[PDB]
Automatic annotation (TrEMBL), chain A:
Pfam families: SAVED. It comes from the Bacteria. This is SMODS-associated and fused to various effectors domain-containing protein. InterPro entries: SAVED. It comes from Cloacimonas acidaminovorans (strain Evry). Residues 292-465 form the SMODS-associated and fused to various effectors domain.
Amino acid sequence: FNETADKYLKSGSAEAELIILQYIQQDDEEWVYNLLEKANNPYIKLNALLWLSAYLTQLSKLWGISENELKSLSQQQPKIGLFPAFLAKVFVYKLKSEEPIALAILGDKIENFSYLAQLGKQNCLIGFNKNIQGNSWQLAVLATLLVKDEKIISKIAYSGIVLPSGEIITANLVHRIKKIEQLDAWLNTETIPLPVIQYQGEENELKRWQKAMEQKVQEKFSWFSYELLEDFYGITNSDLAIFGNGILPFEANAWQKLLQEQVKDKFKLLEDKVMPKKVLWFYAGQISTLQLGIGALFGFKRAVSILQMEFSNTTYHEVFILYGKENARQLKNVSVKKEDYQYIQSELLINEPHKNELGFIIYLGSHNPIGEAKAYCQKQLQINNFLIIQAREVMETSQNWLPYLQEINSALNTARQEYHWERIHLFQTAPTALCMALGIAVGHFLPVDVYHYQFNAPKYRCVFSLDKMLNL
Amino acid sequence: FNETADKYLKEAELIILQYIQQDRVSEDDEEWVYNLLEKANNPYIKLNALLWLSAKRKYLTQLSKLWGISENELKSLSQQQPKIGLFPAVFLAKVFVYKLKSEEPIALAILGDKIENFSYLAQLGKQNCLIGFNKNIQGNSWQLAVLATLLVKISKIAYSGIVLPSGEIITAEEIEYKKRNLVHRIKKIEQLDAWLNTETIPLPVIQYQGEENELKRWQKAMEQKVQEKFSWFSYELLEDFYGITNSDLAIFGNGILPFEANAWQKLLQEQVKDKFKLLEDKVMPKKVLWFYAGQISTLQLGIGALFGFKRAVSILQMEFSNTTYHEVFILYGKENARQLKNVSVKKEDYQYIQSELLINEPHKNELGFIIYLGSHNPIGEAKAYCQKQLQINNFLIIQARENQGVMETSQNWLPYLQEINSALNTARQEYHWERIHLFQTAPTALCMALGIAVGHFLPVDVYHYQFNAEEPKYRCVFSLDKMLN
Amino acid sequence: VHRIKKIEQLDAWLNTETIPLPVIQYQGEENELKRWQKAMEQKVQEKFSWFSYELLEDFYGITNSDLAIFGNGILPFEANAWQKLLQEQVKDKFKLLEDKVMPKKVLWFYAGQISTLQLGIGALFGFKRAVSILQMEFSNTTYHEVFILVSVKKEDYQYIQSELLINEPHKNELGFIIYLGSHNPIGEAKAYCQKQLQINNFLIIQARENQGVMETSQNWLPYLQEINSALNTARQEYHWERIHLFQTAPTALCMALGIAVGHFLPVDVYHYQFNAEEPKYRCVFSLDKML
RNA sequence: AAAA
RNA sequence: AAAA
């Protein structure tokens, strides 16, 4: 009791301090007042302060705080932040005052880092749980001050020293922060950009493509950073990269293995990691044909900025916008008739109406695949029904490419309205982003076997199937 | 009994409680009984002594003066009907609430240790009370039961937490031990007030076939959409207020549904058939505002047919530009649900769909109902399926009028379905159809609405399209008229 | 009288003039019947707050089952089953229930489930009983009294669109078709008469403006008045020895329709069963043969 | 037509 | 047409 409290005052034993803390929490104020000054353990100091919150006048006079606000700390539910030492805690208690007074109770002495209250836009009382040296706990308190939604942030820890002018100094852990505008948006946004890159080749090229893609994402979300993303969710560059060393083999099992190992579960895992907040996917790919599979695994249920690759200058140009004011559904608009076609021209040739097999040939890139795909379908698949989609008058990267995909889907469904096609065989030379958008739109519904073409290799080869993307 | 009370001060509590329950005590020791009301660690004894003193009107003036409670309120407490709240203990104990009319706010709590006036309880409850108890409880986690009994306009629900003068609620320790329906995941005064004094309980119901993580994501999105209109709603709050878990509200299966009519009918019977009935049984006294989204379009026509036109439902369609649901079908409130079944639209008065009726075999009483409001065209495949398999040449083809594949998620989708139903019943005007065959590429919410409107009253066999299947990819998964059987 | 909470409710029970008796017809699980009765209880309490199902079983002993024309599961599609259901339950229901509350009159509240059954119940209900026929509205799950129960010219027709065809003015068989819901019966009923009953004379009753949507916030008596005038109009010009009735009408409308033409016309009533093989129509009962 |  |  009182003797135990006096013994704990004159000793450094942790068991007595914990017992005193438990007794105070579950409910001799002179020893409690004395323990407030003798801040041997910050956890004991904070608990004693709340017991006094419900010598209140003396504490208010000495600490530069009010009286009603001081007694309002007992009736305030603290906000908890985590910062490394183990993982110590910062407790924020509500305080109302005119002058900004961010009273922080520390083991050394109670100090008022007034800049903290101004930055956090709320006067607060700061308590701790352990004797922590340094000022590395600034970031956790500031982050828990700038939060808007009411939820426990124990999943995220922060570390750093916040200087008065609004910058953080270095001491899941978040310690790569440098500006307060970064921290405010990393907790008070609802759409977290997830930049995903599909590259096959050297690791260094993937690295600098990821850097350029981070820059392009920052062009719209200036608060984003790969280091910050890894800090806040553990989503590393490898967690966002559809990678693999060397040239992918022409064997069909290789592409299916690549899709099932990485592409199949990547989006669902990443969206699980960013659990409460929505995701604005940013996608760039390398191999054109693979995207049709990737897009099929990506689906139409994701808001995506699809960006084109530029080899000359390593900069990304967004060509597909599927986010904003109901802009997503526009990719599935199939209302464009043949007469009002402004971008592509479609030729639907049918020579064997009794055969429900169609060769979907698309030429919106550089090399013309019509001859090769026609020979392949007439020699290795026995197909005489073709749907050739090409350009009218190669594609301006600056302009939006949504009409291309809209009219491609419209032509495909117009073909499907008047005939039954058991199998569709996709042979295309199209830009990577357009192939990805086509895979998103057409999806795993229509039976489509996509064949990839390699000029360095039996030039064509059935690489995957749209309907089987939900299986492999 | 004075001797029993003295023995308790120095089994005994049960004797006096039974003795005072029948009012077998005398007024000579009543003042001593008053001392018991101030010298009893068990709040039940103190509350019983207070009630006995109020009934007998003995020495109550001193207590009224000491507690700042009007004598009229103390007298009224004798004949007042105490409301009961339930809160867990270190079992589930009860809180007793008595009406009071004191000018000053006096939410007196007769605790075992000492009597304390939690005045802020009266402010939040908008009524002065005389809190009673039945056993000694350490920690004042009894706040939420009293607050719930105060905010009513009730033994099914129990509460646990601590309130603050701001109105916020904080839970206590031993939450896991206490949780071994118990409401402990609530934080706001408005949340409890609305959850208690609403008229319709939102019931977000989703149909999904896949993995549990994406089901959790979908349910979180549906919860956000519901909270947009009912900010007090929460899946945790629904779970501890009625026992309705996320599994109950989910028409869930693992992986891709097998492409067998037996599998689809088993899924309908095991989960869909009685889900709405049991959920409406759970929230018995209140009405239900079903918020519905689904995954497989064909399964909806059956889900809506079992759902019926007798339920007020907000059918939501997800807009993937912002990954937000939109209430595309509003069938509750001021918006009349009778307009769901408005078949008064003529063909010349169509503004959203384009409908045609081909009759090449008038002698045969069968036709193919093909709906194309999505993007992937089913007309060719379904027509080939009818002509090659079902031997059918009569067709009722419905597509979109202007913008095929894009139906504005911001606008109301009721006119689409109204015109579709009008076209169907105009086809049924001069013709008798023994069987109707339904092949659709239509939005999920529109399919559910069409199933609700058409119901089980028509001979309709619905043929699902399976992407990962061998030809034929159409198969009559169920019949609309056979769902009641 | 034991479950009485407020003295105000007790005062009205012993000193009222009319007692409301809510009668509901339902076929299916008894659990959903309990839900239907609870929704019916609220509508009565708008006009009689003192009314309660629990109190109804105390003063008189009327039980929720006693007020319910109830049968487990789907009613079998046999004419004998329908005639048994009307005879065993419906026919003696209203006469017996009135005798329970003998000193005071009865204001009947009614809402059914099977539209075709209401013609038999409405005919057997009688036109001497004051009735407040309800019709549930589903956007709010509430009941609305659409009926608070002739000689109207065709030109002065407000909401119905009557039509009379006499293609073979030789036989005296008439197909009475009433289309007020949203499922068109004209195609099926016309084909049923020609193929099975050999009938080509038809009287069609159809909504003039809003098919399937008649505002459940007003009085539906003018709707019924137009039907009686149109029906009686054909009888003066042509003598019908037997009229065959097919209807897709609201449940409340059919019950009031049976009251107007109860037992005084040779009318054949045909039900449509959704889960039945062709033919889906069957003469469940004849309106002139329940006496 | 497997949140269109 | 089985609370339209």
